[PDB]
Amino acid sequence: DAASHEERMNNYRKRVGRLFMEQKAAQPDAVKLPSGLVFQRIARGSGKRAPAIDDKCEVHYTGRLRDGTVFDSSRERGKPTTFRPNEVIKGWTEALQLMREGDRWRLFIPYDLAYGVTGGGGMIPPYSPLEFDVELISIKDGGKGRTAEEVDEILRKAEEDRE
Ligand SMILES: C[C@@H](c1ccccn1)N1C[C@H](CO)[C@H]2CCC[C@@H](C1=O)N2S(=O)(=O)c1cc(Cl)cc(Cl)c1
Protein backbone atom coordinates (compact mmCIF):
# COMPACT_ATOMS: atom_id res chain seq x y z
CA ASP A 1 0.00 0.00 0.00
CA ALA A 2 1.06 3.62 -0.48
CA ALA A 3 1.94 4.04 3.26
CA SER A 4 4.16 0.90 3.27
CA HIS A 5 5.69 2.03 -0.02
CA GLU A 6 6.51 5.45 1.46
CA GLU A 7 8.27 3.70 4.37
CA ARG A 8 10.22 1.46 1.99
CA MET A 9 11.32 4.40 -0.13
CA ASN A 10 12.43 6.42 2.87
CA ASN A 11 14.45 3.44 4.11
CA TYR A 12 15.97 3.27 0.63
CA ARG A 13 16.78 6.99 0.59
CA LYS A 14 18.33 6.77 4.07
CA ARG A 15 20.47 3.79 3.07
CA VAL A 16 21.81 5.13 -0.22
CA GLY A 17 22.35 8.58 1.27
CA ARG A 18 24.48 7.03 4.00
CA LEU A 19 26.47 5.21 1.31
CA PHE A 20 27.04 8.48 -0.53
CA MET A 21 28.26 10.23 2.64
CA GLU A 22 30.63 7.35 3.50
CA GLN A 23 32.08 7.43 0.00
CA LYS A 24 32.64 11.18 0.11
CA ALA A 25 34.19 11.01 3.58
CA ALA A 26 36.60 8.30 2.36
CA GLN A 27 38.10 10.50 -0.37
CA PRO A 28 41.83 10.89 0.35
CA ASP A 29 41.67 14.68 0.83
CA ALA A 30 38.23 14.94 2.43
CA VAL A 31 37.88 16.22 5.99
CA LYS A 32 35.06 15.10 8.30
CA LEU A 33 33.95 17.28 11.19
CA PRO A 34 32.34 15.90 14.36
CA SER A 35 28.84 16.91 13.16
CA GLY A 36 29.18 14.67 10.09
CA LEU A 37 29.80 17.53 7.69
CA VAL A 38 32.43 16.57 5.11
CA PHE A 39 34.43 18.98 2.97
CA GLN A 40 37.22 19.16 0.43
CA ARG A 41 39.19 22.35 0.01
CA ILE A 42 39.31 23.66 -3.55
CA ALA A 43 41.01 27.01 -2.91
CA ARG A 44 42.50 28.84 0.08
CA GLY A 45 41.56 32.48 0.49
CA SER A 46 43.59 35.39 1.79
CA GLY A 47 41.00 36.55 4.34
CA LYS A 48 41.92 36.49 8.04
CA ARG A 49 38.49 36.19 9.71
CA ALA A 50 35.54 33.88 9.35
CA PRO A 51 32.00 35.27 9.60
CA ALA A 52 30.14 35.33 12.86
CA ILE A 53 26.72 33.67 13.11
CA ASP A 54 25.01 36.89 11.96
CA ASP A 55 27.53 38.29 9.47
CA LYS A 56 26.25 38.88 5.95
CA CYS A 57 28.24 36.76 3.45
CA GLU A 58 28.30 36.94 -0.34
CA VAL A 59 28.62 33.33 -1.54
CA HIS A 60 29.06 31.97 -5.06
CA TYR A 61 27.64 28.47 -5.03
CA THR A 62 26.36 25.50 -6.98
CA GLY A 63 24.19 22.83 -5.33
CA ARG A 64 23.97 19.22 -6.52
CA LEU A 65 21.89 16.21 -5.51
CA ARG A 66 23.59 12.90 -4.73
CA ASP A 67 23.30 11.76 -8.36
CA GLY A 68 25.33 14.84 -9.37
CA THR A 69 22.50 16.89 -10.89
CA VAL A 70 22.69 20.64 -10.32
CA PHE A 71 19.54 21.96 -8.66
CA ASP A 72 20.50 25.55 -7.76
CA SER A 73 23.33 27.99 -8.28
CA SER A 74 24.31 31.63 -8.04
CA ARG A 75 24.55 31.67 -11.86
CA GLU A 76 20.85 30.81 -12.15
CA ARG A 77 19.88 33.52 -9.66
CA GLY A 78 21.57 36.38 -11.51
CA LYS A 79 21.83 38.69 -8.52
CA PRO A 80 24.50 38.21 -5.84
CA THR A 81 23.46 35.55 -3.34
CA THR A 82 24.01 36.74 0.21
CA PHE A 83 23.32 34.83 3.43
CA ARG A 84 23.99 34.99 7.12
CA PRO A 85 25.08 31.69 8.68
CA ASN A 86 21.97 31.79 10.89
CA GLU A 87 19.63 31.84 7.85
CA VAL A 88 20.82 28.68 6.10
CA ILE A 89 20.87 24.91 6.60
CA LYS A 90 23.12 23.68 9.44
CA GLY A 91 25.82 22.32 7.16
CA TRP A 92 26.21 25.77 5.61
CA THR A 93 25.99 27.46 9.02
CA GLU A 94 28.91 25.35 10.20
CA ALA A 95 31.00 25.58 7.04
CA LEU A 96 30.66 29.34 6.62
CA GLN A 97 31.93 29.90 10.16
CA LEU A 98 35.11 27.97 9.27
CA MET A 99 35.73 29.78 5.95
CA ARG A 100 37.52 33.04 5.22
CA GLU A 101 37.19 35.32 2.21
CA GLY A 102 38.50 33.61 -0.89
CA ASP A 103 38.03 30.07 0.44
CA ARG A 104 36.33 27.69 -1.97
CA TRP A 105 35.15 24.36 -0.54
CA ARG A 106 33.19 21.36 -1.73
CA LEU A 107 30.66 20.40 0.96
CA PHE A 108 28.98 17.06 1.39
CA ILE A 109 26.14 17.61 3.84
CA PRO A 110 24.30 14.67 5.43
CA TYR A 111 20.54 14.92 5.39
CA ASP A 112 20.31 15.76 9.12
CA LEU A 113 22.37 18.95 8.51
CA ALA A 114 20.30 19.81 5.42
CA TYR A 115 16.51 19.42 4.93
CA GLY A 116 16.16 16.32 7.10
CA VAL A 117 13.13 14.08 6.69
CA THR A 118 11.09 16.95 5.21
CA GLY A 119 13.08 17.79 2.11
CA GLY A 120 12.64 21.13 0.45
CA GLY A 121 11.53 23.40 -2.39
CA GLY A 122 9.93 20.58 -4.34
CA MET A 123 13.27 19.32 -5.67
CA ILE A 124 15.11 18.04 -2.57
CA PRO A 125 13.50 14.76 -1.44
CA PRO A 126 13.31 13.52 2.15
CA TYR A 127 16.55 12.10 3.56
CA SER A 128 18.78 13.71 0.90
CA PRO A 129 22.44 14.51 1.39
CA LEU A 130 23.53 17.55 -0.58
CA GLU A 131 26.72 18.51 -2.41
CA PHE A 132 27.77 22.15 -2.71
CA ASP A 133 30.58 24.10 -4.31
CA VAL A 134 30.82 27.21 -2.09
CA GLU A 135 33.10 30.23 -2.57
CA LEU A 136 33.06 32.93 0.11
CA ILE A 137 33.42 36.13 -1.89
CA SER A 138 33.10 38.65 0.94
CA ILE A 139 31.86 39.23 4.48
CA LYS A 140 30.17 42.59 5.01
CA ASP A 141 32.38 44.78 7.24
CA GLY A 142 35.16 42.17 7.30
CA GLY A 143 34.13 39.28 9.52
CA LYS A 144 33.55 39.20 13.29
CA GLY A 145 33.77 35.45 13.86
CA ARG A 146 36.71 33.14 14.36
CA THR A 147 40.26 34.22 13.62
CA ALA A 148 42.17 32.28 10.98
CA GLU A 149 44.25 30.82 13.80
CA GLU A 150 41.17 29.49 15.56
CA VAL A 151 39.78 28.08 12.31
CA ASP A 152 43.08 26.36 11.67
CA GLU A 153 43.04 24.78 15.14
CA ILE A 154 39.63 23.29 14.48
CA LEU A 155 40.38 22.08 10.96
CA ARG A 156 43.77 20.63 11.90
CA LYS A 157 42.15 18.68 14.72
CA ALA A 158 39.58 17.31 12.27
CA GLU A 159 42.26 16.28 9.76
CA GLU A 160 44.23 14.64 12.57
CA ASP A 161 41.16 12.85 13.94
CA ARG A 162 40.55 11.10 10.59
CA GLU A 163 39.69 7.53 11.45
C1 LIG B 1 17.88 30.10 3.04
C2 LIG B 1 17.58 28.61 2.94
C3 LIG B 1 16.10 28.34 2.76
C4 LIG B 1 15.65 27.06 2.53
C5 LIG B 1 14.30 26.83 2.37
C6 LIG B 1 13.43 27.88 2.43
C7 LIG B 1 13.94 29.13 2.66
N1 LIG B 1 15.25 29.38 2.83
N2 LIG B 1 18.38 27.96 1.86
C8 LIG B 1 17.95 28.23 0.48
C9 LIG B 1 19.06 28.87 -0.36
C10 LIG B 1 18.50 29.62 -1.55
O1 LIG B 1 17.83 30.79 -1.08
C11 LIG B 1 20.08 27.82 -0.85
C12 LIG B 1 21.53 28.26 -0.70
C13 LIG B 1 21.96 28.24 0.75
C14 LIG B 1 21.72 26.86 1.36
C15 LIG B 1 20.26 26.42 1.24
C16 LIG B 1 19.44 27.20 2.26
O2 LIG B 1 19.75 27.08 3.44
N3 LIG B 1 19.97 26.51 -0.20
S1 LIG B 1 19.76 25.22 -1.14
O3 LIG B 1 20.64 25.38 -2.26
O4 LIG B 1 19.87 24.07 -0.31
C17 LIG B 1 18.13 25.27 -1.81
C18 LIG B 1 17.06 24.84 -1.05
C19 LIG B 1 15.78 24.88 -1.59
CL1 LIG B 1 14.44 24.35 -0.62
C20 LIG B 1 15.55 25.31 -2.88
C21 LIG B 1 16.64 25.72 -3.61
CL2 LIG B 1 16.38 26.26 -5.25
C22 LIG B 1 17.93 25.70 -3.11
Side-chain angles (χ1 to χ4, degrees):
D1 86 275
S4 168
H5 179 70
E6 178 170 53
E7 183 165 7
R8 278 184 75 241
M9 293 302 308
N10 286 331
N11 289 331
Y12 168 80
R13 291 158 176 163
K14 254 200 145 281
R15 178 178 70 248
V16 299
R18 177 192 59 75
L19 290 160
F20 174 87
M21 287 302 315
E22 290 181 2
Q23 184 241 307
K24 301 304 184 191
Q27 294 175 110
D29 67 329
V31 178
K32 190 166 55 143
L33 294 162
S35 59
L37 178 60
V38 175
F39 68 97
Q40 290 166 301
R41 295 188 186 88
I42 302 172
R44 293 172 175 278
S46 60
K48 142 73 202 303
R49 295 292 293 278
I53 184 76
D54 52 358
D55 277 330
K56 190 179 167 177
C57 295
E58 184 178 324
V59 182
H60 195 258
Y61 73 98
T62 300
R64 283 173 195 281
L65 304 171
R66 57 170 176 81
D67 74 326
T69 298
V70 170
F71 68 88
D72 192 24
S73 67
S74 296
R75 175 180 183 278
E76 280 299 323
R77 305 274 183 167
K79 79 174 145 213
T81 61
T82 58
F83 308 95
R84 298 168 169 71
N86 66 19
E87 283 164 0
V88 286
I89 53 170
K90 302 159 235 93
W92 273 55
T93 307
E94 182 178 11
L96 285 175
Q97 289 184 97
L98 296 161
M99 302 174 71
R100 77 213 67 195
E101 290 190 7
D103 279 347
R104 184 177 169 203
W105 288 8
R106 191 174 296 117
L107 311 183
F108 305 95
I109 307 181
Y111 77 95
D112 58 299
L113 302 178
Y115 292 90
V117 314
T118 291
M123 74 294 279
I124 300 167
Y127 306 92
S128 311
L130 299 174
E131 176 178 336
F132 288 91
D133 199 318
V134 183
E135 183 171 351
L136 181 51
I137 304 297
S138 67
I139 312 159
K140 191 176 179 46
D141 301 320
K144 311 296 173 24
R146 293 183 180 112
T147 68
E149 316 86 86
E150 185 187 346
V151 168
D152 288 348
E153 293 169 9
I154 294 167
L155 298 184
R156 186 153 47 61
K157 183 174 190 303
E159 290 168 7
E160 286 175 347
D161 288 349
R162 172 173 183 133
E163 179 182 294

